[PDB]
């Protein structure tokens, strides 16, 4: 869409309805008459557009008002409330922009932000720009966290986030206009390639390719139908996984292929037995005939002249013999029917197998693709919920960040107090404040203490999950938080980066599949990406394979990599790689995994629980209920945008708004 309604869309909002968050800051309006709502909605929408049309410069309340007309620029308290709301929640002036009103000189409130992931950084900038005192503590010697970009000479390749998943309604859209990201479109085309054990590695032809895919999607829908219509969600007090459900469906497809054949051969027999009965009648009649003809013969035989009874005989037997030849003729008629009604059925057999061995192998590649998307064994995903964020998909083609995704967190880091090599060990929050105890990663006895009004925790769910803890909460987080932590899934996926001196693959093709020999290893090196300027080929390790490949050496890994590739492009077109990398995200102690997924027994609602701030008990008993002190952002905290950079970015903004309302107060709400 476009106009002012394009704006609402590109900011993930309904252009003609007020959202729940808006209703909260503007109950006066939304509970009031329809006319004002549209004024509101228009003001909101116009400001969005204004910001969007130019996100390299701060958009001020004055600058806004200046560009409105009557009846809209009439009421100016409104225009001020709206502008303020938008600014506070990072819908306008987020990211990297030129300030017009350089920073108010002494600052209010003090916030420690654990981790300089994108979520962290996005929050920090907001807060700082809101005039707060912000410090980020980062364990690693760089920012960006799970945005990790491999550099060396001219090779550039992400071992972390790698794709912008469509600009349509994506905050990263804005960022890319504020930052030299080199966005290249990815072409959809993806040839799969069964290697055939040691035999001849060969493409899958456009015929199978399409019917196996088509079958896969047919099978997914089945599980969805099985879930939502039949309520097949608990099996033995265990929740049902996507993996299980896919199995149960596949079985019922096999079962039916058989129920088909059974009734088809049961039809062949019930017909083939009408025949067995007929032939009987017919053999018995050819007896009766044979012998009547004898009788008539013998009566004929009696040479004339004849008395009348002896003449009657000849005539009589003659009639009778003709009668029986009528019959045996209706019956060779009837036999004629069946005899071909049999050559009918016997030429139209129903389907032989549900899926061939070669079929089910391609089907597995599709399954791997899903396991990649969710960084996990389909046996771990929620049947009902695994795909709960689907409505919030962006539009437009996916893109790669050609100059390396790290370019984003780096740019965001500019101007911030980031303490690298500092590993948070303990978080202490109380009615009067917070201290964070961190050590220096290089000499882990050198200790630091940080005092603050509030803590924003952007620790990975993998981290929050460590047993035994790597970060201690004083006091312990409540059951409700720590159970969300247990329930949620934190999966894993890895990357092998291959650097050569020459393109030896099809330059115009961005992605191509490898279809191996077993279900058990469908994840292993199943997909290759050709994205970069230099000659780099990048290969996924997903599913059950991901975890296992982590205890295998780079050489061995690059081994199977070169194998597969020689297999496809010819033994001598595939040179030794000049440079290689292999990510190990589960092993990496500052991540302990790759991104979250809705585990079986969890739901998208656990994501809400995750983002719920923590409020300490009172110091002196009987003292008034305190302020909240411990806040959370991060990919594992945004239900509508899980597992992604833009999701993380968003959660950052979310908390920076919520923290500012709490500690700087909410001007705009009256």
């Amino acid at each position: 869409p476009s106009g002012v309604e394009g704006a609402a869309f590109q900011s993930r909002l309904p252009h003609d309805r007020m959202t729940s968050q808006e209703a909260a800051c503007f109950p006066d309006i939304i509970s009031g008459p329809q006319q004002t709502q549209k004024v509101f909605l228009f003001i909101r929408n116009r400001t969005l557009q204004l910001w969007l049309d130019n996100p390299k410069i701060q958009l001020t309340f004055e600058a806004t008002l200046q560009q409105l007309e009557a009846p809209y620029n009439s009421d100016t308290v409104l225009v001020h409330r709206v502008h303020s709301y938008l600014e506070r929640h990072g819908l306008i002036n987020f990211g990297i922009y030129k300030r017009i009103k350089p920073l108010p000189t002494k600052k209010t409130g003090k916030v420690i932000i654990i981790g300089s992931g994108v979520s962290g950084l996005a929050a920090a900038r907001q807060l700082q720009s809101f005039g707060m005192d912000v410090t980020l503590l980062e364990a690693r010697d760089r920012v960006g966290g799970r945005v990790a970009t491999f550099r060396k000479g001219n090779y550039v390749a992400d071992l972390g986030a790698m794709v912008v998943t469509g600009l349509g309604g994506n905050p990263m859209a804005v960022v890319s206009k504020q930052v030299n990201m080199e966005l290249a479109k990815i072409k959809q085309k993806c040839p799969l390639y069964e290697a055939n054990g040691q035999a001849d590695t060969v493409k899958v032809p456009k015929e199978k390719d399409e019917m196996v895919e088509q079958e896969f999607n047919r099978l997914l829908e089945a599980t969805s139908y099985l879930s939502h219509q039949l309520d097949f969600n608990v099996l033995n007090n265990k929740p049902v996984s996507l993996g299980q459900a896919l199995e149960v469906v596949i079985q019922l497809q096999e079962k039916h292929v058989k129920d088909e054949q059974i009734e088809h051969w049961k039809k062949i027999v019930k017909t083939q037995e009408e025949l067995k009965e007929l032939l009987n009648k017919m053999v018995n009649l050819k007896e009766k005939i044979k012998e009547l003809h004898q009788q008539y013969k013998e009566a004929s035989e009696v040479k004339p002249p004849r008395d009348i009874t002896a003449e009657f005989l000849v005539k009589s037997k003659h009639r009778d013999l003709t009668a029986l030849c009528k019959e045996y003729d209706e019956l060779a008629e009837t036999q004629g029917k069946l005899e071909e009604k049999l050559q009918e059925l016997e030429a139209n057999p129903p389907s032989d197998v549900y899926l061939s061995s070669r079929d089910r192998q391609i089907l597995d590649w599709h399954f791997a693709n899903l396991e990649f998307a969710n960084a996990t064994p389909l046996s771990t995903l929620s049947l009902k919920h695994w795909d709960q964020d689907d409505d919030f998909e962006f539009t437009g083609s996916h893109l790669t960040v050609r100059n390396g995704y790290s370019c984003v967190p780096v740019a965001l880091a500019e101007g911030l107090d980031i303490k690298l090599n500092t590993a948070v060990r303990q978080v202490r929050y109380t009615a009067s404040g917070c201290e964070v105890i961190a050590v220096n990663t290089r000499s882990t006895s050198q200790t630091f203490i940080y005092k603050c009004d509030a803590v924003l925790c952007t620790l990975p769910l993998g981290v929050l999950k460590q047993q035994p803890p790597a970060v201690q909460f004083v006091p312990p987080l409540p059951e409700w938080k720590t159970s969300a932590v247990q329930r949620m899934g934190f999966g894993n996926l890895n990357k092998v980066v291959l650097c050569f001196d020459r393109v030896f693959w099809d330059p115009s093709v961005n992605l191509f599949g490898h279809v191996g020999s077993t279900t058990a290893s469908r994840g292993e090196l199943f997909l290759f990406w050709n994205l970069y300027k230099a000659p780099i080929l990048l290969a996924l390790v997903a599913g059950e394979a991901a975890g296992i490949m982590e205890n295998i050496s780079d050489d061995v890994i690059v081994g199977r990599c070169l194998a597969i590739l020689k297999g496809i492009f010819g033994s001598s077109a595939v040179p030794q790689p000049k440079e290689t990398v292999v990510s190990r995200w589960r092993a990496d102690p500052w991540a302990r995994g790759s991104y979250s997924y809705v585990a079986a027994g969890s739901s998208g609602n656990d994501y809400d629980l995750m983002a719920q701030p923590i409020t300490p008990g009172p110091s002196i008993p009987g003292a008034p209920q305190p302020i909240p002190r411990l806040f959370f952002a991060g990919e594992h905290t945004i239900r509508n945008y899980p597992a992604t950079v833009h999701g993380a970015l968003l959660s950052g903004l979310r908390e920076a708004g919520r923290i500012a309302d709490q500690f700087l107060g909410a001007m705009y709400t009256l």
């Binding site: 896969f216 099978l219 829908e221 969805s224 693709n369 998307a373 969710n374 709960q388 599949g513 992604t644």
Partner: peptide, 16 residues
Amino acid sequence: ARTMQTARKSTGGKAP
């Protein structure tokens, strides 16, 4: 999640 998919997006059980 499904939203992660670039290659051969799955389709089945999505609500267009």
